[PDB]
Design a protein around this nucleic acid. Structure first.
Lengths: 504, 22, 146, 195, 75, 153
RNA sequence: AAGGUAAGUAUCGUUCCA
């Protein structure tokens, strides 16, 4: 690396070797180069830039502090009236120094001390000491050296500017400081070396790993609050889309007994309330605290899981008188918002003139012949399938034409083996829907990610370029442009479509 | 300038214990 | 060079000033409420007490014979279908966070997440790729539909 | 690095020496989007800054004893009246006498005030604790439960932060700007790694 | 057995909340007899749960089997 | 502090749910009593967040008297009793029909000012209210107690 | 004088020496 040691501080030496591992240095220099190469590629025509070249240099040029060389070079389409060497914060260069075709930019990194953390002086000093040099090789007298102070996250640039270059560098660097995969991973490593974190407090999060410990002998309450404020919106075939608010329902499901307490949420409670989201947030908490104070002490819940993280906060205030009740948030996208889409469930709340709370039982008679630990799993599989789609789920749920279902219970009356078959069908349906949505064959999904899909775990890779933690190939990587035949071939496509709208 | 601690013997001419602590 | 002028921040000083300001506000409120609530024969007559009780008893004898909404929907107009009805739930927002309300449907949101994941796997105006992280698609909904 | 409090990364070391801080350690620069700007702490041309000594932050015993007499007289007059007026006392009345008196007034409101009424000869056993526990107790002469802590360091830390240059005047020396947190609020120190 | 070992030596939420020590928040030095003993976020207005961190029961102090045998015989 | 002691020796809630071939099992809505000063208190950590929550809600649900009551309890516990008095006197106009709010205001107001509150509560609740006895022992003179009882009479 | 050697493996050159 380029860090200098004014004394052997062995602990600091170990720390800085750990922080700048995986050749973060060379990688951070290259990352600063290429994305800064990109901004000139977009505004190359607007600056008479014929081409932008990232020449293959020594891989160890990143921390070679004695000498230096250019790495990004602009070949001009026509002569530029270059300005005098000036700093990045300057605005007085009247842009009449000389005329050049080649225009280099040099990027040097620094981990500044406390006294010597003046990045602009650093930049100008070694711009002077690298241009007035016999060992540094810069193709043209014009150019600008850009200095980056990692220890203090400072940035400066001193040297020659062509028309419009300085503000573009200003904006590009303002963006690059606030976001860059190499600098971000450096910041993360520094943070984890000092173990100084921002927010991220620790709570028991219901997840795919600790999902097993849920199945215990202590009663648990799944407070689901998604279906509180909801409006039926539909876009008619020709008329404008129209909306009509309807009633909501709080879910206080209990896996031990299945008693789904349900407070019908009348539309009249929202009597023009400006901040309706927070009213919905504490209206569920009011009813859950009422129900907790209602149940006898042995039936009081010892653990309340919550589907939506916003609800974690209100409960602790309405559970302020119950310190022994653990309120655990859920990372699990657990399908209870679809529980209200059952015909026997919605119909009661879609037509009710006044608000009241009613009790249900999502376990019809299963506990007569099956354990609750698999009754809950059957319920959650059925609800995930119903969330996937209602109609095919119903068709699966009625494998027999009879499909007896009296108003005493809810789910169709089937015995154990038909339950086997219907659960297999629902699993196949859920994996089929996931495969259709994410374009992956179901067989490749092993049982672990099958469980993740069923419970509500799925991950993506938006930060795929932040993989830097993984003849030396640390400057061999090449830049790209439409100037290349492939880039030209990309610009040649769709040229016939632009001829339909032409002006004279 | 140096980080060495200077004895405040002879540095108590204009200070009291209860001052700047109310 | 020359150092510009700017105050120094002190967490003890900030906390003590905040507490002192709160105490002054409480003092002002108490002084106001003293004015607000401070503007408020038969005291020990037992015979007149019995007489008043009698007249109170006899007095009863003498008196005996929603289309309106301005919420926003985090979806595109094209995201809806036609000839069918869709349910629209409410998005999760913290109580402390004072952002505006957002109504979404879980199914369309899940579809958007799935297609976003597919597109981001498929990839495996100044510096936009890193600006979109340092920086969604919705529509104002008024009079029961835009 | 030494006299910075513990949660700001320093060691919070108390001092009673004439420790001068050079004016090269009270300068900090921040790079706004428009451009870098620089700051000092003694922004008017004044004397060299000096670390506050503990000597000026502990009340003399004479003042403490006379104030204890006066404050307990006030409390006695404020309690015998409460007998006649028939109400219990409150923080509102005794805030003006808070943290004063050798048996600190805040001890009266202590949670275990009842059981400490049955704790007699506590100072003697505190003195003899040296023969039962291996490490000597610097506060052998008193007990924080029965007469409260007889010193305050909030003003001392306030003045240390003020003299050291504040949050930015100390964090300029640190690696805080390298971490790139938007602001120093909303942070906690992990005093122990999980591993 | 391994589950109970992990429960005994696991980071209780009150223990893990005490390790966090805030940032830029001076606090009055508790436990006069030995400073440097700050509870951090435990009972701190900086961050943490709204409800008080409930005490755990797995970490309760327990006597040995042979020592309890001595207690039985002595009584 | 106990006046006999010398130097040398919660979140109320109106709602209530009654338990118990038909799947639909509606339950009655029951209103509860009021909450007095509890011996248990101070089971709160991170006050700077809970106070913000209760602040936000006292305009989010301004017609929920136990919100104001819990705010009073929290602010009385943590050495800010005067601000609790002010906040209760502010919130009593938002839920003036609740006996619990007036009782809390009476128990959180000293001296003659307490009378000013209790002589005002009857203005909003003059029918069959326990606040009358709160006035009865809130004052001092037996003659004033007789006058208060007569006004109740 | 200090208490400031990263340990390696790769070749090429040289030189004494057996």
């Amino acid at each position: 690396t380029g860090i200098f040691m004014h004394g052997k501080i062995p602990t600091l030496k170990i720390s800085l070797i750990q922080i700048f591992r995986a050749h973060l240095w060379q990688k951070i220099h290259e990352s600063i180069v290429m994305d800064l190469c990109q901004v000139f590629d977009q505004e190359l025509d607007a600056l008479e830039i014929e081409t932008v070249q990232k020449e293959t240099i020594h891989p160890r040029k990143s921390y070679k502090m004695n000498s230096s060389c250019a790495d990004i070079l602009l070949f001009a389409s026509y002569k530029w009236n270059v300005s005098r060497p000036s700093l990045l914060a300057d605005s007085k260069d009247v842009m009449d120094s000389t005329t050049t075709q080649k225009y280099w930019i040099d990027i040097q990194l620094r981990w500044g001390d406390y006294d010597s953390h003046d990045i602009e002086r650093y930049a100008r000093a070694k711009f002077l000491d690298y241009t007035t040099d016999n060992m540094s090789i810069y193709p043209s007298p014009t150019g600008v050296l850009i200095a980056i102070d990692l220890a203090y996250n400072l940035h400066s640039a001193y040297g020659n500017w062509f028309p419009g270059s300085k503000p573009l560098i200003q904006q590009a660097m303002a963006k690059i400081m606030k976001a860059n995969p190499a600098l971000y991973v450096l910041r993360e490593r520094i943070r984890k070396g000092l173990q100084l974190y921002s927010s991220e407090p620790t709570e028991p999060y219901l997840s795919s790993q600790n999902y097993g410990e849920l199945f215990s002998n202590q009663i648990i309450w799944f407070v689901d609050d998604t279906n509180v404020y909801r409006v039926t919106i539909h876009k008619t075939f020709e008329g404008n889309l129209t909306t009509k608010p309807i009633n909501g329902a709080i879910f206080i499901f209990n896996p031990r007994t299945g008693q789904l307490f349900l407070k019908i949420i009348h539309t009249s409670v929202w009597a023009g309330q400006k901040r309706l989201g927070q009213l919905a947030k504490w209206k569920t908490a009011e009813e859950v605290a009422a129900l907790i104070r209602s149940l006898p002490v042995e039936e009081q819940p010892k653990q309340i899981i919550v589907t939506r993280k916003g609800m974690l906060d209100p409960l602790e205030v309405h559970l302020l008188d119950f310190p022994n009740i653990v309120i655990k948030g859920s990372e699990l996208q657990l399908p209870f918002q679809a529980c209200l889409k059952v015909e026997k469930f919605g119909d009661l709340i879609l037509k009710a003139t006044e608000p009241q709370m009613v009790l249900f039982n999502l376990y019809d008679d299963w506990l007569k012949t099956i354990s609750s630990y698999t009754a809950f799993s059957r319920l959650i599989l059925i609800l995930r399938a119903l969330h996937v789609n209602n109609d095919r789920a119903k068709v699966i749920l009625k494998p027999d034409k009879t499909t007896i279902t009296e108003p005493h219970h809810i789910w169709p009356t089937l015995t154990d083996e038909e339950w086997i078959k219907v659960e297999v069908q629902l699993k196949d349906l859920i994996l089929a829907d996931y495969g259709k949505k994410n374009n992956v064959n179901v067989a490749s999904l092993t049982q672990s990610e099958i469980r993740d899909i069923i419970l509500g775990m799925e991950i993506s890779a938006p930060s795929q370029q932040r993989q830097q933690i993984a003849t030396s190939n640390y400057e061999t990587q090449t830049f790209s442009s439409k100037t290349e035949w492939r880039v030209r071939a990309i610009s040649a496509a769709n040229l016939h479509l632009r001829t339909n709208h032409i002006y004279v | 300038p140096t980080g060495e601690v200077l004895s405040l013997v002879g540095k108590l001419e204009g200070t009291r214990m209860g001052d700047k602590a109310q | 060079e020359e150092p510009v002028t700017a105050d120094v921040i002190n967490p003890m000083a900030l906390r003590q000033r905040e507490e002192l300001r709160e105490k002054l506000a409480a003092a002002k409120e108490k002084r106001l409420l003293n004015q607000k609530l401070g503007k408020i024969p038969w005291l020990d007559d037992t015979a007149a007490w019995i007489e008043r009780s009698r007249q109170l008893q006899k007095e009863k004898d003498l008196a005996e014979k929603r289309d309106l909404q301005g919420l926003t929907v985090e979806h595109a107009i094209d995201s809806f279908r036609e000839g069918e009805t869709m349910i629209l739930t409410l998005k999760d927002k913290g109580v402390l966070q004072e952002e505006e309300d957002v109504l979404v449907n879980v199914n369309l949101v899940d579809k958007e997440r799935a297609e976003k994941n597919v597109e981001l796997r498929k990839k495996k105006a100044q510096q936009k790729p890193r600006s979109i992280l340092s920086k969604p698609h919705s529509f104002r909904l008024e009079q029961g539909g835009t | 690095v030494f006299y910075t409090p513990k949660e700001l990364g320093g060691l919070g070391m108390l001092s009673m020496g004439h420790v001068l801080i050079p004016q090269s350690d009270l300068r900090w620069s921040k790079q706004t989007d428009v451009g870098i700007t620089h700051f000092r702490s003694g922004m008017s041309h004044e004397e060299d800054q000096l670390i506050p000594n503990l000597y000026r932050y502990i009340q003399p015993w004479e003042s403490e004893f006379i104030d204890s007499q006066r404050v307990w007289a006030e409390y006695a007059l404020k309690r015998q009246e409460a007998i006649a007026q028939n109400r219990r006392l409150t923080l509102e009345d005794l805030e003006d006498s808070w943290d004063r008196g050798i048996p600190r007034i805040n001890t009266l409101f202590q949670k275990d005030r009842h059981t400490l009424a049955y704790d007699k000869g506590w100072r003697v056993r505190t003195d003899f604790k040296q023969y039962q526990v291996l490490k000597q107790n610097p506060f052998w002469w008193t007990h924080q439960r029965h007469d409260g802590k007889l010193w305050n360091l909030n003003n001392y830390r306030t003045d240390m932060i003020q003299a050291l240059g504040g949050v930015e005047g100390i964090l300029e020396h640190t690696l805080f700007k390298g971490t790139y947190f938007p602001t120093w609020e909303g942070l906690f120190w992990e005093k122990a790694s999980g591993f | 057995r391994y589950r109970k070992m992990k429960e005994r030596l696991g980071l209780t939420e009150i223990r893990k909340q005490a390790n966090r020590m805030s940032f830029g928040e001076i606090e009055e030095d508790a436990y006069q007899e030995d400073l440097g003993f700050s509870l951090g976020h435990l009972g701190k207005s900086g961050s943490g749960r709204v409800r008080q961190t409930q005490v755990n029961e797995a970490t309760k102090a327990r006597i040995s089997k042979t020592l309890q045998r001595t207690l039985q015989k002595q009584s | 502090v106990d006046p006999r002691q010398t130097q040398f020796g919660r979140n109320t809630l109106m709602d209530m749910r009654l338990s118990q071939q038909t799947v639909v099992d509606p339950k009655g809505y029951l209103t509860d009593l009021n909450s007095m000063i509890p011996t248990h208190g101070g089971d709160i950590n991170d006050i700077k967040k809970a106070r913000l929550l209760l602040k936000s809600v006292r305009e989010t649900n301004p017609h929920h008297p136990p919100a104001w009551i819990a705010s009073a309890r929290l602010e009385e516990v943590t050495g800010k009793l005067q601000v609790a008095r002010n906040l209760i006197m502010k919130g009593t106009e938002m839920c003036p029909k609740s006996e619990d709010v007036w009782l809390e205001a009476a128990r959180l107001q000293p001296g003659d000012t307490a009378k000013a509150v209790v002589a005002q509560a009857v203005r909003h609740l003059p029918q069959s209210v326990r606040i009358y006895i709160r006035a009865a022992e809130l004052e001092t003179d037996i003659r004033a107690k007789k006058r208060v009882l007569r006004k109740a009479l």
